[PDB]
Design a protein around this ligand. Sequence first.
Ligand SMILES: Nc1ncnc2c1ncn2[C@@H]1O[C@H](COP(=O)(O)OP(=O)(O)NP(=O)(O)O)[C@@H](O)[C@H]1O
Ligand SMILES: CCCCCCCCO[C@@H]1O[C@H](CO)[C@@H](O)[C@H](O)[C@H]1O
Ligand SMILES: CCCCCCCCO[C@@H]1O[C@H](CO)[C@@H](O)[C@H](O)[C@H]1O
Ligand SMILES: CCCCCCCCO[C@@H]1O[C@H](CO)[C@@H](O)[C@H](O)[C@H]1O
Ligand SMILES: O=P(O)(O)OC[C@H]1O[C@](O)(CO)[C@@H](O)[C@@H]1O
Ligand SMILES: O=P(O)(O)OC[C@H]1O[C@](O)(CO)[C@@H](O)[C@@H]1O
Ligand SMILES: [Mg+2]
Lengths: 432, 432
Amino acid sequence: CPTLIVMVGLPARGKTYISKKLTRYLNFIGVPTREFNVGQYRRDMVKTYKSFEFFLPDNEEGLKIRKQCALAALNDVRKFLSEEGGHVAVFDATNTTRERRAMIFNFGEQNGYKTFFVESICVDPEVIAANIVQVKLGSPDYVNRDSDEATEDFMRRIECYENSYESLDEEQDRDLSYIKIMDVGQSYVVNRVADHIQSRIVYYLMNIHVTPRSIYLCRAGESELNLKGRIGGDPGLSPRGREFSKHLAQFISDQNIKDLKVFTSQMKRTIQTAEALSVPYEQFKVLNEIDAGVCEEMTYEEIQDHYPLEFALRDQDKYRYRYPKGESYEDLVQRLEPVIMELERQENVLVICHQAVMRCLLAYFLDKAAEELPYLKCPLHTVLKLTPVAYGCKVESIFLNVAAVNTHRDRPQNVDISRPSEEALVTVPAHQ
Amino acid sequence: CPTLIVMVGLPARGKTYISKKLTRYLNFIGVPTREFNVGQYRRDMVKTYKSFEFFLPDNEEGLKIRKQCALAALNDVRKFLSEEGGHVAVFDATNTTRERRAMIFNFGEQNGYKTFFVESICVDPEVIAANIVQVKLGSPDYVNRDSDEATEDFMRRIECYENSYESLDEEQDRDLSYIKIMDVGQSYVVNRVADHIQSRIVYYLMNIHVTPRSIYLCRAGESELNLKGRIGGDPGLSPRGREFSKHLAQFISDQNIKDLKVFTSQMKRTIQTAEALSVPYEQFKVLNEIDAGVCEEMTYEEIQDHYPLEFALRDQDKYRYRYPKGESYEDLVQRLEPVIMELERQENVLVICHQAVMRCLLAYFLDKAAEELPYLKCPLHTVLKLTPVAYGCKVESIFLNVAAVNTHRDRPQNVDISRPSEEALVTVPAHQ
Ligand SMILES: Nc1ncnc2c1ncn2[C@@H]1O[C@H](COP(=O)(O)OP(=O)(O)NP(=O)(O)O)[C@@H](O)[C@H]1O
Ligand SMILES: CCCCCCCCO[C@@H]1O[C@H](CO)[C@@H](O)[C@H](O)[C@H]1O
Ligand SMILES: CCCCCCCCO[C@@H]1O[C@H](CO)[C@@H](O)[C@H](O)[C@H]1O
Ligand SMILES: CCCCCCCCO[C@@H]1O[C@H](CO)[C@@H](O)[C@H](O)[C@H]1O
Ligand SMILES: O=P(O)(O)OC[C@H]1O[C@](O)(CO)[C@@H](O)[C@@H]1O
Ligand SMILES: O=P(O)(O)OC[C@H]1O[C@](O)(CO)[C@@H](O)[C@@H]1O
Ligand SMILES: [Mg+2]
């Protein structure tokens, strides 16, 4: 049974924000998910600016168009889940009345889906008025609109909804599976989680927040095997590596951060790097570098020479193919699900890790496709600072002023199985 | 910061049941946890039978003894978290008033703990009458007590609480971190989860239930390597394993179970065993047998001969010591946490797995210590039926009438490092 997640809530309550986060997360863990924004359907259709009058519960051309757009989107939900093999569809609309929700529920019922509701009720001033100055900012609806008039219009638009707004009821909606999220995550009300996927969605939703904070990601300092062009293993830091540790520690202080939690893997290179900090760290084996299996501690020349076909295949699909007894980047992603969860839940946090692991975490916060993830640039002695914002995440690359080797191998233009060794290793960075 | 879980609710609301499941779960995942039942403190202090009068709001003698039992328990909570190195303490008492909960909360505050409340609510009388028949049955309080009088007395005891009962309020208790469980876990209210452990506790509590059902555990049938006395690998079924598959299918039918979900690992022996039932199934790599690393596909004789230091060590701490590039039973336990979660969430379920995995799962439901876990007996072609009950889990061993080899190796009396090889392999079951 595919799942139909139905957003419920007044405009500017974070329904879309939640819809995007949930959709991105689900896709990241490999569940084909797609969001359907009814407002976008409405914009892409009328093409002409509309005032709040169009949202009035008595307007004809308005109620007509809005219901048609809801049906258009629902038709695409049907196609995605029933025809394209999608697993979860997120239907982003106010859906503030029991009749509309009953309508949508029956739709799901008839098409063989399981419906689950997600209501967002924001009440805190620094959220409502806070989302407006983002609606008023990035919304196509208020482009080239006088500030005071746009702000006023939107307020009357929310009013068009408050008047008939029927929030999910403990008794009247006992039989529905849903979650009510208050004040962007302070409290929650959960009812009738029907299955495994819903239990995971709930778990995720109850762990995200919008508290300002930053996520710092960096690899351990250059190690002995980084110098030799060797992958995997458990080397200690190189001299220049220890030098970086000292630089990270300074950077961290200069940053002046409220309650920084530091995490490292169980590999010496990260722990050693962490020892330079003042703050105590927490080591987790789940953060360990991607296992190369049989190709552990080898160089690329050695892999090509010993495992020539697997090297070519990995080059063809670096996301899905693994070395013998090793992991794929796909595997790594499954392994890091608990890290993604904790990072969502954390506030200010520094993660000292490795190249593959760091690519995965960066792909998550910057929403990079699986195919592009195994190739993201995560240089040594460089600190990636991630600051979550509305719909996105700002990234700042901060080189900590200490040279280091290039462990980054681009994909060669020739990824053929029959290719010669020269072309296979032409992108291999200089080492030793 | 150790955590202080404070149970809240009227008598016969499942506070204790929840306290024991939560305590067992937390310990299983390696978080030193201890529950403190205030009623047991009361029973041990007084020794003599007490009518409802003893619990009266005005009974001066009883108000005092109950106050001495509450503080006694709290002093032990303090000793455990602050002196014994415990991580989580579950304070099991009614704690039905705002003023009481604030006293407890201050205690936690002063001792450097984080307080989290778990309220269990039940306003359904058949459920209460059903529960009482467990209180009236297993409670030391109503031993040798006339049924109608016991039942009556307990009802008046609940009233001693209902009258002053102030449930956790959305507004009044806005600053408290808590979870309210309603309709025996149908709905929930969660407020201010403060950290990672609370987030995991919430996740766990929202996924357990008391819907009657059974958990069936059995290994895959005898395999080619079982015959050879070889551990690990990915062998197929032996002629007997196939025969068992045919026996398990029959047993499953004879059982006449409602909606049986079947799970297997990604190893052929389990899948092949599953292929013989009348119902479909799902496979999971998380269920794969414990990784022996370098000692994969080896025999015990071979392990003693090639890695003597490790066979002796693993023999010393079979829970914590691992083979090189392999897992420890401790690691397996961590790996199976998502399996524990799902099994709790499931109703009627059959898991076709392996020896080490089945030991871990059996240790969870039967609450066997980590030190005893790596040694539980899980014979081939033998089905272990687990039926969860109040505070425990009933276990029925069902041999499916098909002979098989012994893969069970008792801990040899000599586990001394540098021990003679004949003593090291004396408990090795005959094979080939
Ligand atoms: N969420 C729940 N709601 C209702 N009953 C439950 C819940 N969880 C467990 N039970 C049942 O409650 C019974 C166990 O009750 P018990 O734990 O003795 O209650 P209690 O609140 O600790 N009473 P007391 O110790 O007398 O104050 C069993 O029959 C369980 O199946
Ligand atoms: C940290 C110290 C906790 C003090 C616990 C006070 C125990 C008094 O017991 C009280 O009994 C009353 C009727 O008998 C009930 O109504 C109250 O809920 C209960 O708290
Ligand atoms: C930087 C990332 C920090 C990760 C914090 C990990 C907290 C506990 O990690 C836990 O490990 C268990 C098995 O080991 C898994 O089953 C759980 O899903 C995972 O949360
Ligand atoms: C003993 C059998 C229990 C099997 C447990 C299966 C665990 C589910 O495994 C995976 O977990 C991921 C975590 O979010 C989900 O996203 C995936 O959909 C799910 O398949
Ligand atoms: O996937 P790629 O690009 O080969 O990079 C991964 C390698 O990078 C390293 O982190 C160091 O170069 C190795 O541990 C790892 O195998
Ligand atoms: O951990 P123990 O008791 O030595 O035995 C576990 C072994 O049992 C088996 O399941 C079969 O003998 C192996 O796969 C596994 O390695
Ligand atoms: Mg109790």
